[PDB]
Amino acid sequence: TCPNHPDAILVEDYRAGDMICPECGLVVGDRVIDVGSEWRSRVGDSQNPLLSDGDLSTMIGKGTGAASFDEFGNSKYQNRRTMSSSDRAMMNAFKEITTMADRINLPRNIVDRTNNLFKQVYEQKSLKGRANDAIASACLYIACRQEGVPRTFKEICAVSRISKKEIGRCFKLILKALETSVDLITTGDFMSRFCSNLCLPKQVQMAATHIARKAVELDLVPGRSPISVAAAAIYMASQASAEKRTQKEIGDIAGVADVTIRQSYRLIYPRAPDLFPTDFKFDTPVDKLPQL
Amino acid sequence: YARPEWMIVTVLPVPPLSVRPAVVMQGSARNQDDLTHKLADIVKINNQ
Amino acid sequence: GFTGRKITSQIFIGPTYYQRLKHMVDDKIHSRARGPIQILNRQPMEGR
């Protein structure tokens, strides 16, 4: 832009309001023009960027006088509004995702990642026949897992109308049709949620997350779901402390059947003192645990 | 300079961009002016 | 205080509670040679 030195980048002097090059100090161009608002409005709200770019339509307000009403007791000018059937689907899905996420009290950043995942899939258009609620509820599952805090399928299925089988199929098909790799869950990621819901203290939480990580690392129970070893970790940490919790209350939070938690407990039991940390205040002795 | 039929407008003059500029307000988001929104409704009804 | 002479009048002096107000001259001083201009008016902007 500078005549003598065109290669140098222009530095901006907003205080002095002009374009100056930093070699010879010549002022190029004209006075800088602010692109922001002059007040501290004559502009409207921006289009939602994730919503597809439609039209800059306005709305018609309520009638104010006799000239705004027809003689059969109604307004002459009606608030007809254009919107694409694709934008109607995106809006109704986004309005379902915020409903879905706020039922389990997700933060807004998971919602924004879900809406990013929904818009990316919907424009790529590989999921033609599956219901919009099913694909949206699967995108909420992935965005929860991609932020390092995944959820149980039963936890998401409790909120949505969509069954576990259907969201499972939608979860498989989205990963295949997005070429997106997502990390495998562990037992430590399902520890803070499953322990605070049952009203257990921090030291009980630390004991539960230690015996769960030790069981996975030692590889004592192949092929069991991480839910079944997390609830077993809660069951030992609660039965070997003051705050006792029965299998019904633990399994209700975990969705794990009161069969499955015993099936998990019949093999993790006989090596109990190896799993516990060396600095745990044992309110209940290890040999005093019930033989379940 | 002013005929009576010229007051009954049949073509609507669209203002230039210097009359209705688009602002940038806390990030990359072009907030259009009220005239641009109103001229959007003019074209949509006229096309309809 | 300057010449050391007694002031002929007798000054009324004593402890009085005073407050300092947030209206401070460093928050109010403002000058502008040439600066940014508005997107619509091409006139100088509003306020320091």
Added chain:
RNA sequence: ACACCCAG
């Protein structure tokens, strides 16, 4: 845009 507020 609105609130609050400075000076007369």
